[PDB]
Structures are given as C-alpha cells and as structure tokens.
C-alpha cells in the first residue's frame, strides 16, 4: 500500500518525476508537461510528459509529447517553457542532447491548433535554433533551460538560456525577429561570479502596487509602473533564489535594486525543499502562477521500493509587494474547494507556558489550517544575538525543547497520538540590534522528530518573515501525507518539508497547536478545513 502517495498534489500515477515543464493557458485550458522518466523511479531516459487541467487542481492524463526520436535530441528531452505568439499560437522551446551529448536548444510546436488539449508536437527539421559551438565557446555541458520568450519595444524576440564559464554563473540572451533565426547577443542579460551553473532561469515584469499578473512582453502602460524579476537554480546550492530590478531595453541587461546580489544571498521562493521554479502567465485570471519541484526527502532504495519520486507544489499565486522588498505567494484559490463543507473552528484559546491544543475532527493528514496568534507584552521578547544571521542555523542550533521569551508558538503537524513522531512548524520573536522599535520574526520548519525511521532527510528549515507583530501572526498549512506547505505573514515567507512517518498516517495522524515560550499567548482564530482528493494522473 501507499500511506506516502499525496491526495491532492500533483504527481504522475508511478515513478520519477523533475521539473515542472513549460506550463501555459491556451484555448481556456491549463497544460502541465514535466520531465518524467517512464519506466524508472530514478533519473533516466527522461521524457516530456503532459497532462491538463481546468482548474489547476484536478489533471488529465496524455501520451508524452516530447520524447528522443531526432538528432537534435537523441539523448535527452530536458526541461524548456512555451511561449504564447500574439496570435494565440503556443510554441515550446526545450533543450535536447545531441549525438555528442551536447545541450542545444529545440523548438517544437503543436500538430493539430484545433485540438485544445495539444496531444502531438512536431519538431522542425531545422533544430537547434541554438547550440554551442567553437565561435561562441559556450560550454556545451552546461547550456540548458531555455525560458518564455518576450517581444521587445524594436520588435525583435529576446529570450534566455542557463549557463556558466569556470564558476561564473550567467544568463545568456538571444535575439530573433521571426523566431526562427536566433542570434547569441554579445553580452549576457546578467552574471554573477562564484555562483555555480545558473539553472532554470526565469524573467518576468510585475506592477509596483496589485495583485494582478503581467504579461511577459508587456511595457505597461504609460500610467502603470513596472519592475522586473530575475528568477535562477543555483546548481551549487539546490536552489530557487530571485532579485527585483529594472530591465534596461537600451543596453539589454537585467538591473537588480539597491542592495540586491544574484547569488547565495538573494530571496528564495521557498526556504524549504523546492527546486526548478517556472511561472506562466494565466490571462483568464490576470495572475502569475508559480509551478515548483519538490523532490523526495527519503532515502532512494524507498523510492524504488514504493515505486515513485517525486511531487509538485499546488501551484502558487505571485505579485510583489507594497514595500516593494519581496515577492509574496499564495496557493491558488481553486485549492480552497477541495474544504469539506464542514470546518473545524477555534477562537480565543489561551496556550500558556509548555501546553498543546489537539485539533479535533479532522482528517488530519489531509487538510488545511489557518492560525492567527497574538502576542500579549512585546517587551518580553528576548534580544537578537549578535551574529545570528542565518534563519536556517536559528532553527537547527535550538529546536523546540529550547525555549525563548517569545516562542517556540505555532502549530505540530503529521503527528502521533502520544507525539513520538511530529513535524513543528513554529514562530520566535526576537528585538532587532538596531536603535528603533524594530523586530525580528523567525518561522521554522522543525522535522527531526518528524519520522521514526533513521535514514530519512530530517533537515531542519529556517525563514524571517516581514510582518509586525503588533499585529496577529498569521500561519497556514497544507498537509498532505508526505508534504507540508507552511505559509507565515500571508505568504510573505514559504516553507515546503518532506515527511514519511511511520505513525501518523491517515486514521492515526494527529494536529496540535503548541507553545512552549516562558510567555503565555493568545490563539485568536483556528480553522482546520478537511481536504478531499483530486483527480490526477
Ligand atoms: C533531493 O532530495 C535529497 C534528499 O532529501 C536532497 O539531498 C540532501 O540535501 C540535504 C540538504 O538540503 C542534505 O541533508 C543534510 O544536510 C545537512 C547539512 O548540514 C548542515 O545543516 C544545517 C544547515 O544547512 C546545520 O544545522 C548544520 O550546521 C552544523 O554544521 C556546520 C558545519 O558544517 C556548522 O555551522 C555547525 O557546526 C553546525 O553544528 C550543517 O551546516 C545536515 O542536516 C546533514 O549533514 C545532511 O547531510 C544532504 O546533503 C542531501 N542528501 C543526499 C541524499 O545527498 C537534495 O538536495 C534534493 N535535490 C533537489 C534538486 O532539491
Ligand atoms: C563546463 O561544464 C562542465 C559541467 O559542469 C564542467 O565539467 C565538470 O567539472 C566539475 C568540476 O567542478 C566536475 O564535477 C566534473 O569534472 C565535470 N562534470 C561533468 C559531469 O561534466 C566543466 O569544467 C565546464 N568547463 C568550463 C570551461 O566552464
Ligand atoms: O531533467 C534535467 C533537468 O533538471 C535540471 C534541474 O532540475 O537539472 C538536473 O539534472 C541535470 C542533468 O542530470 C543535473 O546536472 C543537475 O544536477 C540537476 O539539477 C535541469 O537543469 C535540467 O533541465
Ligand atoms: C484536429 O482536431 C480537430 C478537433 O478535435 C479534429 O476535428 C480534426 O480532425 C483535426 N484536424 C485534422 C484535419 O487532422
Ligand atoms: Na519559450
Ligand atoms: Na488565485
Ligand atoms: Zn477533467
Ligand atoms: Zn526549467
Ligand atoms: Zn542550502
Ligand atoms: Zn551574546
């Protein structure tokens, strides 16, 4: 049986999945193609495989589009993204391996434009549109990734591909004026040295003040102010960072604001397991979606032994926010019909020093959970050590039995009835160093007790979150059997852990809400909603 396999995330019926693979919206569906290896449950013989959705929850099966059968990709069909013609037409460009096994760049599009759910792909005779060679001196082995295209103000196509020379990380832009003949332009879009392989690159505008989505190839208006987001995979690192800037069309490179660097240092996504992020542009919602992998935290002799690898987030909604410091994410609001009509519901509960408060009523390794905590006197809260820096080292260094003034608050998810598994995702307050009332809000993701088995990946997560904790502490979480997706602040910081208890499964599985701060705090509201499967394959 299959107490790991996730109700309502999306994952292929068996065997290994990758990365998310030019996700689009034509003709009023949603596709989803990914890199799938269809006969193993570890990396292999890697092929596109494709599947729709009305709704971006519910997914429809598909034969692979686009599998080894040309020169041009012989030894591999690797990840890529479809662009969206102005005349609705959609194209997919996607690296290949070659008889040499080098990666060059493909374009496929669809056989039939009046099937609306694009089961065939025919690639032209004329590939690769873009390949290393002597003159160029790209590194062949490392050339990959090739993002969604934009049209520029001088009507020529730009787009990106990931690549690096010794150490030095770099997004490699091309022109086209037919997108047919592709021209390498002389210098990078942008490049950062000491960062390894800069995978999975993305580039995208967004407006300074909504929610709503931009599209890709657009200047705004002449009202409406835009800046623009550099998204990449550092291969060194395993992943997903991104920086704000303005994209200067003159010179074409990639400007990241004042105090930015595209490296190790830069915002992630996801402070958790997440790789090999792409976005889309979803023009019947106007709205950004965020598709991301998450690969599996167990050791690899249990995926081939349950016959799988591999799931990928419930996709997520992406805009920049007010301070204009970050990008904030949500899960899509589709997934909030999968609630059972019935909702568990508490409110004004006092947790103090050292206590827990079980969730009852819910099945609860499948299910949805909104917190808002308050916190009573501010002043107690304990002053940031000196050289505490890093969030994730915070979380590692003290785990829940460490208590501070404010904190360890939040919630246990996936756990035993009498807690010999639990997966904590919590809230610490600190004082900031500096002169002003300023304060430091950290959100971890504490899986160490999470599973009885030893040789899991218990690795613990760590993430600040930007909000005032003046206000109530907002925290959410997805749980479905094997993943968890923690949300602090609104989606102002996003954690996704792994987790394969040997206990807390289905019927068995328990939630609580904890605090084991010196200082009592206040629950102010609680909703757990029940979550029903969706239909994928
Ligand atoms: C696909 O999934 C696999 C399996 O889940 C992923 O591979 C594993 O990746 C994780 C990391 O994400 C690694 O697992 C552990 O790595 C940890 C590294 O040790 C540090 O952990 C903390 C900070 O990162 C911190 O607590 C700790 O600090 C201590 O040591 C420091 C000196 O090094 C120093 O600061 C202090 O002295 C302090 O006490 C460490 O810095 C750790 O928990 C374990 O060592 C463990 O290795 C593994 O490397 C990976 N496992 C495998 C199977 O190789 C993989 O990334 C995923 N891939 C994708 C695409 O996402
Ligand atoms: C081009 O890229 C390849 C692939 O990364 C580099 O070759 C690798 O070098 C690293 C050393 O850090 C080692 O892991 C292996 O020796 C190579 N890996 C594989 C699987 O090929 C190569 O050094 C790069 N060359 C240049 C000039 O940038
Ligand atoms: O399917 C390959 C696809 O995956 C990515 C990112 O997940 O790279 C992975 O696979 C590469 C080839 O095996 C590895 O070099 C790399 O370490 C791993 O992350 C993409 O780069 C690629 O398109
Ligand atoms: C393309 O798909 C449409 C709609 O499914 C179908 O009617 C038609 O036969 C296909 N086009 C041709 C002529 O192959
Ligand atoms: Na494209
Ligand atoms: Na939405
Ligand atoms: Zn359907
Ligand atoms: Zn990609
Ligand atoms: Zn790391
Ligand atoms: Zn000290």
């Not at 099945?363 to 006197?377: G, I, S």
């Not at 035993?416 to 639990?422: A, G, P, V």
Request: some cysteine; glycine content about 6%.
């Amino acid at each position: 049986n299959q107490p790991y396999r996730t109700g309502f995330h999306f994952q292929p019926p068996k065997n290994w999945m990758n990365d998310p693979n030019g996700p689009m919206i034509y003709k009023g569906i949603y596709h989803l193609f990914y890199q799938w290896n269809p006969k193993g449950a570890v990396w292999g013989n890697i092929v596109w495989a494709h599947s729709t959705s009305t709704d971006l929850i519910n997914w429809d099966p598909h034969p692979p589009a686009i599998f080894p059968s040309a020169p041009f990709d012989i030894n591999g069909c690797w990840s890529g993204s479809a662009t969206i013609l102005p005349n609705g037409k959609p194209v997919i460009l996607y690296t290949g391996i070659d008889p040499k096994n080098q990666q060059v760049q493909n374009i496929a599009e669809p056989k039939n434009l009046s099937d609306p759910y694009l089961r065939e792909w025919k690639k032209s005779p004329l590939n690769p549109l873009m390949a290393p060679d002597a003159v160029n001196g790209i590194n062949a082995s490392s050339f990959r990734d090739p993002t969604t295209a934009w049209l520029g103000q001088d009507k020529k196509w730009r787009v990106i591909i990931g690549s690096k020379i010794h150490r030095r990380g770099l997004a490699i832009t091309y022109t086209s004026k037919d997108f047919l003949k592709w021209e390498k332009s002389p210098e990078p879009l942008h490049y950062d040295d000491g960062s390894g392989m800069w995978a999975c690159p993305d580039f995208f505008p967004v407006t300074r003040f909504g929610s709503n989505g931009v599209e890709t190839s657009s200047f705004g208006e002449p009202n409406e102010i835009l800046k623009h987001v550099l998204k990449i995979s550092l291969d060194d690192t395993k992943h997903d960072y991104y920086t704000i800037g303005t994209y200067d069309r003159v010179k074409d490179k990639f400007v990241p604001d004042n105090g930015f660097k595209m490296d190790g240092t830069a915002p992630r996504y996801d402070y958790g397991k997440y790789y090999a992020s792409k976005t889309f542009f979803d023009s019947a919602k106007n709205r950004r979606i965020l598709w991301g992998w998450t690969n599996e935290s167990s050791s690899v002799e249990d995926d081939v032994e349950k016959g799988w690898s591999g799931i990928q987030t419930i996709p997520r909604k992406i805009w920049l926010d007010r301070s204009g410091k970050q990008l904030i994410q949500w899960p899509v609001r589709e997934v909030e019909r999968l609630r059972t009509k019935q909702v568990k519901n508490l409110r004004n509960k006092v947790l103090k020093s050292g206590s827990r408060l079980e969730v009852y009523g819910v099945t609860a390794a499948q299910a949805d959970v909104e917190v808002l905590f308050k916190v009573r006197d501010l002043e107690k809260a304990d002053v940031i050590e000196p050289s505490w820096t890093d969030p994730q080292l915070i979380c590692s260094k003290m785990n829940v039995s460490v208590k501070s003034g404010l904190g360890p608050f939040g919630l246990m998810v996936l756990a035993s009835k009498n807690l010999e598994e639990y997966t904590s995702v919590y809230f610490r307050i600190f004082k900031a160093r500096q002169n002003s009332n300023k304060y430091v809000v950290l959100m971890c993701s504490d899986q160490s007790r999470s599973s009885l088995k030893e040789d899991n990946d218990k690795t613990t997560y760590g993430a600040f979150v930007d909000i005032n904790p003046h206000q109530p502490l907002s925290l959410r979480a997805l749980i479905d059997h094997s993943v968890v997706e923690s949300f602090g602040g609104k989606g102002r910081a996003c954690i996704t852990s792994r987790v394969y208890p040997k206990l807390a499964i289905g019927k068995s599985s328990h939630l609580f809400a904890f605090n084991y701060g010196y200082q009592s705090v206040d629950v102010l509201n609680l909703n757990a909603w029940s979550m029903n499967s969706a239909q994928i394959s």
